[PDB]
Amino acid sequence: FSLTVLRARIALLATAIGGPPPYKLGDDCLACLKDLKRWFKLVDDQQKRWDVAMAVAEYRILTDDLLPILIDWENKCSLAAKLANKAYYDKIALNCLQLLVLMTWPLIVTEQSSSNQITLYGELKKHQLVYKKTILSMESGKVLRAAIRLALDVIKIDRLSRTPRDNMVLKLVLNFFRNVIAIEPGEFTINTKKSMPKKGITSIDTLPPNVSMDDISLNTVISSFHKNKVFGFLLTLTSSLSDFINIPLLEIMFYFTKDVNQELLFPRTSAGFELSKLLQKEHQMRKNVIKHTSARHSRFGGLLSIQTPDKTRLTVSGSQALVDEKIALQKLDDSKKWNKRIIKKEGLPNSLLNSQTGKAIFFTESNGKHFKEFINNFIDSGFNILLHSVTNYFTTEQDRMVTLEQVEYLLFFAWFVKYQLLRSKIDNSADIKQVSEALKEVTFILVSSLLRSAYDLKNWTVTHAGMIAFNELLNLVSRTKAAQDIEFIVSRLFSDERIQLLSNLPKIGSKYSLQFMKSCIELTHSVLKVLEQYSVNFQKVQANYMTEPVIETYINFLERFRELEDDSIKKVFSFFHRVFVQAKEQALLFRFDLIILLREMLSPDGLDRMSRSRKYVSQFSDYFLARLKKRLKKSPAWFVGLLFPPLHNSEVGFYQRYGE
Amino acid sequence: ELTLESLSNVKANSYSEWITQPNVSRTIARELKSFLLEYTDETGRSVYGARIRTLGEMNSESLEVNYRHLAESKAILALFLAKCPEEMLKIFDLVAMEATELHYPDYARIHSEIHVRISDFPTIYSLRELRESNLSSLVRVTGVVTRRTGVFPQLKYVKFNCLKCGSILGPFFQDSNEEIRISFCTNCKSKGPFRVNGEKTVYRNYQRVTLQEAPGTVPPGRLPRHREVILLADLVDVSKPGEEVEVTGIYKNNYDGNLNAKNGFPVFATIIEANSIKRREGNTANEGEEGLDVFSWTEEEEREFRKISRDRGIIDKIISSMAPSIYGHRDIKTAVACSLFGGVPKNVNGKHSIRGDINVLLLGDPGTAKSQILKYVEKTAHRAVFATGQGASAVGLTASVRKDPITKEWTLEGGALVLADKGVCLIDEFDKMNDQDRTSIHEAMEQQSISISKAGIVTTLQARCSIIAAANPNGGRYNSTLPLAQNVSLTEPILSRFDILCVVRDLVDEEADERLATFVVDSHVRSHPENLNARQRRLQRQRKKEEEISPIPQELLMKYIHYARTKIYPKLHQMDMDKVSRVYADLRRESISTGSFPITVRHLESILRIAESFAKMRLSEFVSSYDLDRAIKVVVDSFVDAQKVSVRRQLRRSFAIYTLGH
Amino acid sequence: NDDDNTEIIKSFKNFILEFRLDSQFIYRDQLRNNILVKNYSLTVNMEHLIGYNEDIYKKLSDEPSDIIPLFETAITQVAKRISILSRNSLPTFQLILNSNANQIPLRDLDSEHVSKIVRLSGIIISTSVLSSRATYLSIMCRNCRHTTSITINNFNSIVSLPRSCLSKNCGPDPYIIIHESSKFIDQQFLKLQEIPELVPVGEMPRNLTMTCDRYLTNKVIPGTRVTIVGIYSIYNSKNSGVAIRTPYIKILGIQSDVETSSIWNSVTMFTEEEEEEFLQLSRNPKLYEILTNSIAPSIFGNEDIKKAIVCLLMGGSKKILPDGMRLRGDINVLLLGDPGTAKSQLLKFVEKVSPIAVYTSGKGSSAAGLTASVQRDPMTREFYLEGGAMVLADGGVVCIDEFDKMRDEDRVAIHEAMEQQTISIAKAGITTVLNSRT
DNA sequence: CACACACTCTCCAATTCTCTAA
DNA sequence: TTAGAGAATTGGAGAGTGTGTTTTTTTTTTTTTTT
Ligand SMILES: Nc1ncnc2c1ncn2[C@@H]1O[C@H](COP(=O)(O)OP(=O)(O)OP(O)(O)=S)[C@@H](O)[C@H]1O
Ligand SMILES: Nc1ncnc2c1ncn2[C@@H]1O[C@H](COP(=O)(O)OP(=O)(O)O)[C@@H](O)[C@H]1O
Ligand SMILES: [Mg+2]
Ligand SMILES: [Mg+2]
Ligand SMILES: [Zn+2]
Ligand SMILES: [Zn+2]
């Protein structure tokens, strides 16, 4: 009975505000706006119900009433700003935007959260997408042009002349930008209280019919940003950095770039050439597929017996097996219906924290061109200044930072410092000094301390937020060394204290997500190349790398060849290639896991024949087989020792791993 | 407290959701009650107050609410009803019950619920033009009824009893389209068998009629589409099989596994839950009229009937207003008017039964407007059926048996004379039907009952028709020098049935030709399609054109005829039986010698029946002497004018003494 | 519920015992006389039940299907009291009701009147063969052989074997009926068609399934007009909407006007006073003129035809000679003549006055519909005969109006049924010689 | 009816896990 | 850090409740419109 009364009040407020067909402000509009604000605030935190927002979304208040308020105020604001009760006509938009940011606030569910919040999270996440869907498509999304008025009114006055109260207005308006663009589809929380049936989840599309994946992607957000001029707003806000406009702004312009790769920026009928190439690749893989299918129908009945050792007469069907004995053996292998158990595992805005390499958001060519220059202009305007502004705050309240701050800060830092270096690599028009300002000693030691502290608390996500920056630390050290003593103080503290941390993560993180494993291989590849120009010892750092779990975690990445790219396979294979003659530690490489992956590599079903990956790999595997034959021919026990793991006995450790 | 303006500003995204809001529901109910209590038309009287008075007076249970009235005032409510009728009909039914309880307190004892029959829906569809966009919205399809199941009681409020643990389940509303689903019980989550409770359960009537696209509106040569129509309580048995009706109702769809299996696609089955039914069979020329019954009269209409009936010479006005756009032929018009009003069907002590309907035979030369008069009669009469010449078989005129394709047993279905029961049956080109087809209407035209004893079905249907047949003389021209029997191929048994036999002659008189040509040219000019809003301006133009030729309006003439037929039964108390006996004796004496028209006792009863029809025309409850002298004149004139020209003058001179005064 | 049931039983028992109009206990005497001739029933008038105690009538008319079995139990108890010396095996008596309530037209029986008592009139068009409904159902458990009994009331509410061993699990349905110890009663399905004078305008007559029971079976024959006092009940036959229910009437009293099966049940069921009245009538010296003057009194003249119609109605005397051949005793009359001479009115009157009569027109009548039609049973796929006009009118008169309009191949079928008075059928594997003494 | 299918109800030993082991 | 003693959980066979069939429209009459 309480819920339907709440619905009655929401409907009563809906018909009290007014409507169209020009929208009309009803009597006591401010009073009803304040009443709605008070009710929503009371039910949000004081009572923790999350039901008033639901009723508002139901009456389509945000679309039918709230948006037209700002749209109707926009023309009056333009007329007043071009002509040359303004306070009453200005304060009306304040409450509307305060309501908008409150409803657009992301919803977080944890164990401490009550059942109502988790129950309504799945029913309100779709409405969250609805809000951003209707906002972006509302006549070029001009509501953001009205939003920036709620900031330029306060920022216009002198910064030293700021207001102890009006200062919260800037935070409230700024939160709206980061809230609207952080809206992403949620997860279908399957009810796992009982065993699931012989069929899985039917539909994973968490989108209401009014919401389409076309109209909610970050491409739409970036197009709306460009068409609403707010690029100038974001540039001018950063141009006047010289506190409260730093923490929100850290993620206001980061959300749409939290997971967008920089490779799509440069291509390296224009879109149709890649279309033709992809058609060629899929034609090749389909051609490889049909090599197994019989020339005739399945019911042709091709039966055979393999005269296997012991004169066995095992019967396996299939005319395909009559072509090759290997096909018959594979049909023998996959005939078994028994399988083992494979164990498996975002609380913060989804991104690298949960995005596979192929999740490249489609961009319009014009939109891509605009976004290419927008971020470059931001870097040329205020990048290092913004970093130095938050350097002081980062040095304090180390234990007072919620896990959201690390994931929203470290990813931003690493992504932009990586983008600057790749942009400088592709084109020389950008100086390295534009990113060289991040080599400050205090910033480096603080970020390293955060990375090491995240290890002991089992905060794997926060630690993965740190490796992505640690890779670019070594990359930038190399870039500023080759293109050149400031780099020494940043790249000499990893002598004894930091070697354990970098040499332990690969041995333990192999039982987690793919990206966690991908971080460590890049770390090792970068660290093996930064020190090559000075060699504290080349033969000593590599000694701690040649360990069996390290080889296991490197070879576990190779099993995903159906999705590994040229560089992903290149780094993994080059790690073993660079130690073939420089280290000569191939004895630990003698597990069957690498041999079966080599068989998969050279097989046409794996790597592409026309590409430039399988040729050098095939030649190196040809040499690998020669090494295997030479080492196996000299030890009969090594024929079966190749399968079993190595031993801890003293004499055999040098007898087998080194051959006396 | 929302104004009508808020109702137009939907807050809930969906309309059904918008209507279901308690505040919006209360506002809509209040607005509809205000509309019912306060709507007044041009004449100033409250339409729905009188409608509710009539509803309660006859325990009608159904309130006929015109859609045009709902659209003119509070158009947002009309839009809501036309878009989401499922809930608007419930709200408006509750409002109608409240209004009736206002006029008739404690009416819930007579009828618990009052249904609303929306009439005059603007957008008329056909069973071919329905699409998915019409789902769960009011439609007004038109088609001919094909099948009709029996009136099976249907569960209204199912109150199941749990078998495992509980004993009471919620009074679920049956949707009349899909079976009620119980699923997990409330007393315990465990599932088991369920069955209804006979203690507190109410039933409603249920009939599933199968509409089929009318052969008139079907494109020529194409197969006709068809949809099943559910007739709920108070709507059952209102559409006879084979009749053509216009069905207003919600166009709903329900899922059935059989259809999905057959078609292989997740396709649904649609069905129309009828909200009102108007029959358009036998009045296909009556477009432009309003209401579910063209022949229903309001209290003011009845007062107007009683006011105009008291006029002296109302019979002449009614006769002159039969075929206003057909010049001359006053004898034919008189005969048609007498047939349209009919006589009183007697029944002596329950044993002897006398026919009470007048049969007319129009026999004459071509191009004398015999078929046009028949078409007019079809337009005017309440229940009229048109059948022509060879296109009417013996069993299609009266009754036929068929093996039911679904149940596989012999069933009896009526024909033209049953579909026109207590109406008129029009047989154009009477003389061109097969003899073994023409003889099939001998019983139904005198005994007024069709007797069928075929395929083990021994029954006697009832057909109180009134045949009006247009014939054509042998050779195409009526030879005045020969008797009637020599001009037609019909025999005495079929010629004696017709009370009035009008002989039409196409002669050449320059004055008559001039007058007829002037009338025809004037009528052709008047009927030209190129000859304060649009509706009442068009109505004013129609009345202006009508008043030129027809003294009494046609839309009022139809109601007048229906009122006289269904509410008047004149008696022959005050009469001079000696005059009728003398007339009959003279008729027989002159029939046997120098004549061929058969004069049996049927022609004696024809005088009484025609006198009763004339008394009906004046709405009188007693046959006056004038109404008897006029019937005698009609009968003797029809007898005389069918005689050969040699003896016609002598016969007229002999019979002049009975028609003294005119 | 035991206390209320016992109270109702005792109340109606006291109604049986105490009711008397003037010095004669009507229902005690009727019950004893019925028991004497092995007529285990009781024809209870409804005015008497209202006058005795209107509360009992209110209870009965509220929920008849639950109260009537109690009244039958009370009748059985009174029968044991007044026909058995204290210190059994007496069948449950049947209650036959007689009412004078306003007749509800057969088409007016709608959602309301369901489970109510309705009195209505119609003409029977079909009578099923006798079925067998169980009353005492001796029953035995399949596994543990726990024999028990079930008693059936046959007034369906709107019972089945128990779904329990009812005294190792024995399964869900452990009961099999013992057919050598059960007791059954005969039940017949009728089919009522509404009066031809009561059908609405332009509507076909409507049928209604009906059920008799015990002493109300074999009481009517097709074509007879009856008035029924029954319970307009509901049953869900599994033979096309949703939640639809096939309606039917459970008969509690039939009041024909033409006697029972056969004529007066092939014998004389004439009350003594009316038999004496007939004897007094037969001695009237002008009986011939009285009978002639009362045949279609509205038809002037036609004295000779009225006399011949009287002779036709009475008929001759049938003879069956020792050698086997029989001589028919029925009179056929043909009325030729000019139109308008009231032949059809005479035929229609004869269709009324005659106790058994069928009116048919020559035009709308076929040979297979006049004598006998071989029809295929929709369920069993087996051919069977359905009687025609000359079988319905058996023992009476069939009036064939418009005789000369019959097709030449249809009029021939009457040749045997008019003289030999038997209908010979050899179709679809059937070979029978029916009887038509019309 | 009963044999075969689909599937809810129900259940211990091999498979995983983290406290105490070497 | 290693070879080995302790907790802790849940999938794969099986007890069991309820299903689902076989199951049919031939051939023969009777009607009706054309032929
Ligand atoms: N002698 C008579 N007495 C009373 N009414 C009569 C008499 N003769 C004829 N009628 C009436 O005249 C009409 C005769 O119609 P019907 O008797 O049904 O037809 P019919 O006499 O059989 O002639 P058919 O059938 O066309 S050959 C009825 O309305 C009778 O009431
Ligand atoms: N008296 C008349 N007044 C007006 N029109 C007439 C008259 N007689 C005949 N007509 C015209 O003759 C036309 C044909 O008439 P029709 O229906 O063919 O008569 P029939 O079938 O007897 O030949 C009609 O359109 C009608 O308008
Ligand atoms: Mg014509
Ligand atoms: Mg006749
Ligand atoms: Zn329950
Ligand atoms: Zn048992």
B266 and B521 in contact (C-beta within 8 Å)? no
CB C148 within 8 A of CB C170: no
- The residue with tokens 């053509």 is B244
Surface of C (334-373) touching B: CB under 8 A: 338-342, 344-345, 348-349, 352, 358-361, 363-366, 368-370, 373
Question: Can you tell me the distance from the alpha carbon of C44 to that of C96, in angstroms, rounded to the nearest whole number?
Answer: 6
Compute the C-alpha angle B614/B618/B621, nearest 5°.
85
The answer to whether residue B390 sits within a structural domain is: yes
Q: Is C319 on the interface with B (CB under 8 A)?
A: no
Identify the DSSP state of A245: T
Same domain, B229 and B304: no
Structure tokens at A620: 């190196």
Query: CA separation (Å) from B216 to A535, B280, B415, B518?
Result: 100, 12, 18, 34
CATH number at B63 reads 3.30.1640.10
**Is B365 one of the annotated binding-site residues?**
yes
- Rounded Cα distance between A603 and A582, Å, is 29
Bridge partners of C185, per DSSP, are: C133
Contact A244, A167 (CB under 8 A): yes
- Which bases of chain E come closer than 7 Å to a protein CB? 2-3, 11, 18, 25-34
How far separated are the first and last CA of chain C, in Å rounded?
Answer: 57
Annotate A97-139 with DSSP letters as a single string.
HHHHHHHHSPP---SSS-HHHHHHHHHHHHHHHHHHHHHHTSG
- Side chain identity at residue B384, one-letter code: A
Q: In DSSP terms, which residues pair with B467 in a beta bridge?
A: B425
Secondary structure letter of residue B282 according to DSSP:
T
Q: Which residue is nearest to nucleotide D15 (CA to C1')?
A: A341
The span from the CA of C246 to the CA of C238, in Å, is 9
**Are B462 and B425 members of one domain?**
yes
Instruction: Assess if residue B5 is contained within a domain.
Output: no
Mark which of B281, B305, B326 sits at the end of a domain: B281
| Joined tokens for residue A567 | 């560089």
Q: How buried is C190 (Cβ within 10 angstroms: 0-12 exposed, 13-18 middle, 19+ buried)?
A: buried
**Whether residue B142 sits in one domain with residue B112:** no
CA of B374 to the centre of ligand 2 (A): 11
Nearest to B2 among A15, A20, A60 (CB): A15
Residue nearest to atom 26 of ligand 2 (CA): B369
H-state helical runs in B388-447: 394-397, 416-419, 435-438, 442-446
Considering the domain architecture, whether residues B62 and B141 belong to the same structural domain is answered as no
Looking at the structure, do residues B47 and B138 belong to the same domain, yes or no? Answer: no
Q: Report the half-sphere exposure of B656 (CA within 13 A, side-chain side).
A: 6
Q: Do β-strands B62-66 and B203-212 pair in parallel, antiparallel, or remain unpaired?
A: unpaired
User: C165 CA, E12 C1': separation in Å?
Assistant: 35
Contact status, residue B354 vs residue B346, Cβ threshold 8 Å: yes
User: Structure tokens of B563?
Assistant: 């009122």
How many CA atoms, within 13 angstroms, populate the side-chain half-sphere of residue C386?
A: 22
Distance A658 CA to E16 C1' (A): 64
Measured CA to CA, the distance from residue A562 to residue A564 in angstroms comes to: 6
Please choose, from the candidates C351, C228, C329, the residue with its C-alpha nearest in 3D space to the C-alpha of residue B453: C351
Q: ∠B591-B595-B599 over CA atoms, to 5°? A: 35
Contact B151 C110 (CB under 8 A): yes
Two tokens, residue B658: 């009975």
- B462 and B402 share a domain? yes
CB contact under 8 Å between A12 and B21, yes or no, is no
Q: Are residues B339 and B259 in the same domain?
A: no
Contact C337, C304 (CB under 8 A): no
| B68 CB neighbours strand E below 7 A | no
Q: Residue C393 in contact with residue C433, Cβ under 8 Å? A: no
Give the structural domain span for B72.
22-123
Expressed in Å, this structure's resolution amounts to: 3.1
Which residues of C participate in the annotated binding site for ATP?
A: 337-344
Residue that is last in its domain, among B174, B202, B230:
B202
What distance in Å separates the CA atoms of residue A511 and residue A556, rounded to the nearest whole number? 10
CA B462 and chain centroid, separation: 18
Under 8 Å between Cβ of C356 and C261: no
Same domain (yes/no): B275, B302: no
Segment holding B503, helix H or strand E: strand B500-504
Would you tell me which residues 523-582 of chain B have a C-beta closer than 8 angstroms to some C-beta of chain C?
A: none
Cα within 13 Å of Cα(C262), Cβ side: 6
Question: How many whole angstroms separate alpha carbon A511 and alpha carbon B622?
Answer: 109
Rg (CA), chain A: 30
Contact (CB, 8 A) for B11 and A59: yes
Ligand 2 nearest atom to the CA of residue B366, by list position: 23
Last residue of a domain, one of B123, B142, B172: B123
Q: Does a structural domain hold residue B378?
A: yes
- Find, among A178, A181, A98, the residue nearest to A136 by Cα: A181
Sequence-distant (6+) residues with CB within 8 A of A564 are A557, A558
Cβ B66 vs Cβ B290: under 8 Å: yes
Identify whether the C-beta of residue B470 lies closer than 8 Å to the C-beta of residue B428.
yes
Q: Which residues contact B20 (CB under 8 A, 6 or more apart)?
A: B12, B87
The set of residues, in sequence order, having a beta carbon less than 8 Å from that of B336 and lying 6+ positions away, is: B322, B323, B360, B373, B377, B468
What pairs with residue B211 in β-bridges? B145, B227
Task: Find the Å distance, CA of residue A519 to C1' of nucleotide E12.
Answer: 39
Residues B30 and B143 in one domain: no
Q: Which two tokens stand for residue B255?
A: 């899922």
Neighbours of chain B (3+ CB pairs under 8 A): A, C
Note whether B268 and B253 are within 8 A (CB): yes
Alpha-carbon gap, residue B576 to B579, rounded angstroms: 6
Cα separation, B611 vs B624, whole angstroms: 8
**What residue spans of A156-254 are helical by DSSP H?**
166-181, 213-216, 218-227, 230-239, 247-252
In angstroms, what CA-CA distances link B26 with B1, B33, B78, B167, C280? 8, 11, 16, 35, 80
B420 in reach of chain C (CB within 8 A): yes
Does residue B172 lie within any of the structural domains? yes
Answer yes or no: is B600 within a domain.
Answer: yes
Does residue B9 fall inside a structural domain? no
Number of domains in chain B: 4
β partners of residue B203? B155
Is B523 a domain residue?
yes
Quick check: is B303 in a domain? yes
Q: Does B329 share its domain with B243?
A: no
CA of residue B190 to ligand 5 center, whole Å: 7
Q: Is the CB of C344 under 6 A from ligand 1?
A: yes
Residues in chain B: 662
Residues B100 and B118: their CA atoms lie apart, in Å, by: 17
Residue with tokens 């966009």: B133
In CATH, what number is assigned to the domain containing residue B441? 3.40.50.300
Per-residue DSSP letters for A345-408? Answer: ---SSSSGGG--TT------HHHHHHHHHHHHHHHHHHHHHHHHHHHHHHTS-STT--HHHHHH
Helices within C295-342 (DSSP H only): 303-314
Task: Let me know whether B307 and B416 are in one domain.
Answer: yes
Closest nucleotide relative to residue B391's CA, C1' based: E33
Nearest CA to C163 out of A113, B163, A425 is that of B163
Residue B211 · residue C246 · CB < 8 Å = no
| Structure tokens belonging to residue A172 | 């409230």
Q: Name which of C69, C264, C282, C104 is nearest C194 in CA terms.
A: C104
Torsion (CA) A262, A268, A273, A276 in degrees, nearest 10: -80
Tell me how far the alpha carbon of residue C346 lies from the centroid of ligand 4, in angstroms: 10
- Tell me, using a 6 A CB cutoff, whether residue B69 lines ligand 2: no
Q: Chains C, A in contact: 3+ Cβ pairs under 8 A?
A: no
CA A484, chain centre distance (Å): 33
Report the alpha-carbon distance of residue B656 to residue B452 in Å, rounded: 46
Regarding whether B228 and B129 lie in a shared domain, the answer is: yes
- Annotate A513-568 with DSSP letters as a single string: -HHHHHHHHHHHHHHHHHGGGT---HHHHTTTT--HHHHHHHHHHHTTTTT--HHH
Which of 134-153 (B) contact C at CB < 8 A? 149-153
